[PDB]
Amino acid sequence: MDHRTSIAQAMVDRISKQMDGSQPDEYFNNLYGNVSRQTYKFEEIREFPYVAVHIGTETGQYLPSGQQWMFLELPILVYDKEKTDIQEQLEKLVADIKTVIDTGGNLEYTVSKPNGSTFPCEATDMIITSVSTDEGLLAPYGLAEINVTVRYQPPRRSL
Amino acid sequence: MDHRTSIAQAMVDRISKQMDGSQPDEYFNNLYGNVSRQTYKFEEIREFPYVAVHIGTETGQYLPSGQQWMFLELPILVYDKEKTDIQEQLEKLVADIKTVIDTGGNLEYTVSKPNGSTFPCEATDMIITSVSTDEGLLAPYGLAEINVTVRYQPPRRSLR
Amino acid sequence: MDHRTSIAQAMVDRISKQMDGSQPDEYFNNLYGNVSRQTYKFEEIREFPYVAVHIGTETGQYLPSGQQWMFLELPILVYDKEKTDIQEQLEKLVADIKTVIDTGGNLEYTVSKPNGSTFPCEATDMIITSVSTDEGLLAPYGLAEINVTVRYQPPRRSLR
Amino acid sequence: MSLQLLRNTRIFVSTVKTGHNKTNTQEILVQDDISWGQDSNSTDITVNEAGPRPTRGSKRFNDSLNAAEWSFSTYILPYKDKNTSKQIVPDYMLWHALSSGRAINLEGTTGAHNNATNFMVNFKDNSYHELAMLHIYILTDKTWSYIDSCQINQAEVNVDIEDIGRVTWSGNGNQLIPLDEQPFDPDQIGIDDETYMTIQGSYIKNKLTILKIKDMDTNKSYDIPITGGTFTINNNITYLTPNVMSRVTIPIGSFTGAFELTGSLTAYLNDKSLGSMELYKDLIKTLKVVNRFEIALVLGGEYDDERPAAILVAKQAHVNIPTIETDDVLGTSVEFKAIPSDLDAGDEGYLGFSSKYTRTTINNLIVNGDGATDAVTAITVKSAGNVTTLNRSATLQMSVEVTPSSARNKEVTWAITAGDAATINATGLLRADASKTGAVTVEATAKDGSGVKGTKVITVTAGG
Amino acid sequence: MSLQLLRNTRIFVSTVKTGHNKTNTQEILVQDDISWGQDSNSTDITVNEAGPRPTRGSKRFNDSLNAAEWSFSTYILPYKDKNTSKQIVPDYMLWHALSSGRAINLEGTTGAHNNATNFMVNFKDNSYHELAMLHIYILTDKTWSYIDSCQINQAEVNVDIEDIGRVTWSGNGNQLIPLDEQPFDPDQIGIDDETYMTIQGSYIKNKLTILKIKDMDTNKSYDIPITGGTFTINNNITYLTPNVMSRVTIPIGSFTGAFELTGSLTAYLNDKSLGSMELYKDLIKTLKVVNRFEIALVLGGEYDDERPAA
């Protein structure tokens, strides 16, 4: 009942729906739906900017009444080409990512059941613990990684 | 008074017996008994999806009344060929294994005593520590590391 | 909402405009605007003395009222050609940078908003952690690593 | 020459001092939180005079000896005993001592009486100036030390700790007397290997600890997932001691204090109806002097499959005002104390233990106090002749059928609630009269207090 | 179904319970040290008679309800207000309530009255049996809870901690009444984005905390660099409650205690004249019954350039 990849899909479609031309005054960049949780080789990317999501480790602590505390970790990576300046466009990308992470309601990640019993569920926490970027790579190329520890309580009561 | 291989056999047989199609409304996949206590090599394996139960270190504690708490680590590995997409399939399988490992009773392992007689036995509890995915591997072949620490207590001894 | 490169640009421009000869009685050297936010390679550099402002990670903290503490690491490297002696020159330059970083007000960076409007902004404080010298380098080419962690608070958000 | 290691300590409990047998004596597996001893009082006399070169000095006198103390933790371990095929726990002598003061009697109906379905301890019949007297025999390595006469004083149950559920006993003793010779063969008396094998497969996990709580004033059932909690049974035992000055004395007698089945709970804030939010709002807004809450804390949870569980029942348990707690996630702690129907009644609460606790079993235990005896689940009302209407001046002695068929209390009460068109009695003979032009409904309430409801709307009108 | 996260709590302070507006109500930013609640008293009656088979039992009665408590920490954030072009701080009703009991009046000359140059709170005109009453409205996630009538009891300012200077408020309240419906639109009432923008560039660093101290009797100024220090404003508020036994009651009134602007200092020993050693020597040798020292604590230091400071 992990829903880890459900959380990943929640992130990918959250980013996709948000950060569109509908709300340009709030977020900088438009992706036209260029976002996916599937990681690819860096050389393999078709167009930029592009954002990828990694599903990291998922620790867990139990609680007396069956409550589970899963601290799932989602690294976020962004790639872009130096069309005007790597630093500035990368900054805009990371700022937009942070804004979409914080502003708005919590995650709405779909829970899929064996008997097609799909109903929605939500996390509780979203904190971007640390933001860092890679330097010294091909000057045209850029990379920034975001560490998001989505903390979610699974709907354990269903079992 | 050790039952490591016994505990692993209990876990593997639980996986097998509780993976058939007898519970389609409770579980996702059906390994068709493709569960084993040891694997020669990832390359060696042929059929997917396949789940490997490993054996780790076995920490121990000593208690005043001659009791003995001993924690056994049971890393569990899974694999799958990308029939549709590795991530979703591995999530399905890992959720199924978590359901297999959290629901039901206790780990029933059979201890073969030196006399030659086998007695039913039961572990105390089974708590998973963390589930990790080894991403970046060969695209058609995925991997998900799920770590468990089975807490079991051996037959009472060490009186003196 | 982030202003990392904005913070770096603010610090670099502060270095630039507070290092001319307009304050000879307070500062030692005169970089003549030889300050930049990015360097291709130590070898690539041509004119000395040259100071490089780098970008590190950025730890984050969350406070109850929707506030947000962000701690940004700003490693700053300096270089100097041994006109008389590397040690003394690097001491003079590090003293100049410490004065630039401990005197005056707060880091004034300009945050360009998505609508296209730029607003003046101010960091909270600028505390240095440690200064380090990478001795053993090529004698005519010196290096002094001065590490800073600028503490800045972004525009209020994350209400929900 | 040798050293004694705490790892080699075995704690025994016996109700007598001689003729030790497997029945009058028993071993209890303890945990590393084992401690005992016997401290002493002391008086120092000194002098104060104004003369030059004063008399700086003092002398110490040993006056008395405080009653011994002790405390160990044993895991709650229900299991079936092959000899009697009835659920029991290893430390049943301890539960009996905490409960009553009469001679232990497992078959009885009060105190530590077990049942084929489950082992229960009943706090009735605990009115005694001295509870059952135990003599703890402590074997460590090879030395022998025992406590003459001790009475259990506290039994703490902490669930917040993730480990398996444990109980912390405590008490006092007259005099820790070392023993120079073994009292009995330990191997024969101590629990044998087979019993250990049977026990280890019956541990209780706090990972599954569901709680039931219902405000018997409002008859509203709350759904609360705990995050931590505990309940302690305290006897407030005090030890009388002589006060002779010339020679050193020993506490001779004991006086049991006041029973206190105090406990506490804590949970996160949940906005879903009948959750922690709803309880918080009810208890703060209402602001009543006294409350009547039926609290049931179920260690090990319940399941359709047979599984172990330890159960606390505190009927009409007083509840204090909840106090909100602030941390990474908000939580509220509720402190409760179980009060009786009457001061001397002694029905503060009772407990249940068994390896085979089933949801039906657990509910019948809650509403009856015994696992074996069942309770009514579903009730429907069947009219005499299966008639859905009645005319004026006619009698309908409507009958009733309960479920399950094995319920102990087949008898239910009768009541007419909605409308005024007919009158019914205890027999169930519903009677109408003239000028009854409104439909009426007949309600029933189970005599066992299970909480089953049965409804039927009968269209009684002017007739033909 | 949801869980309330402390990260999603906003605190509001209003001088009234109705007609909430930006002037009579406002939000105050709260740090991670936030706590509130309302505990209760309890009396347990038991019996003791020597008869065989005694009556072991007790019954608990809820007698009354202790006045609520609370405490939070807010950074000191002076800034100019575009509307009035005068210095103010975000939590100015808090200062007003800690100061006076008369209705807030920013333009006045006593209590929380600001000036074009600076916002200053004057403790004169604090003679009142009950200081200005504040009702703390607490929003968390989506639940609504407020405290009926609060009076600030303590404002502790600590500088030794290296972080930005902070103030720890604390008070008491009659009863913690949960609320089922929202009292007012939070976004309109709460501080808007622009105000946060302006405020964040006004924090004060304890890294520069100069102190001035002069012995009025001797007219000597000591040059002392602090290493740590604190000062608290205590009103010693005592809450009075009835003593009805049959029905549970609530603290109805309050009596302000004795004003106490207690404080503390600490520094290293410095042999240079008019240093710590000189002050220590003078104080120990002189050994007078009473002293008159004019103490000034300057958080954030002072400079020729314009910069914040408390």
Numbering used by the authors:
A (entry chain D): 1 to 159
B (entry chain C), C (entry chain E): 1 to 160
D (entry chain H): 1 to 464
E (entry chain I): 1 to 310
From the paper:
Using electron cryo-microscopy (cryo-EM) and single particle analysis, we determined the organization of the tail proximal extremity of siphophage T5 that possesses a long flexible tail and solved the structure of its tail terminator protein p142 (TrP142). In siphophages, functional tails are produced after capping of the tail tube by the tail terminator proteins (TrP), of which siphophage λ gpU is the prototype. TrPp142 is resolved as a hexameric ring, interacting with the last tail tube protein TTPpb6 ring. TrPp142 is a 161-residues protein, mainly formed by a four-strand antiparallel β-sheet that lines the lumen of the tube, flanked by two α-helices, and a short loop between β-strands 1 and 2.
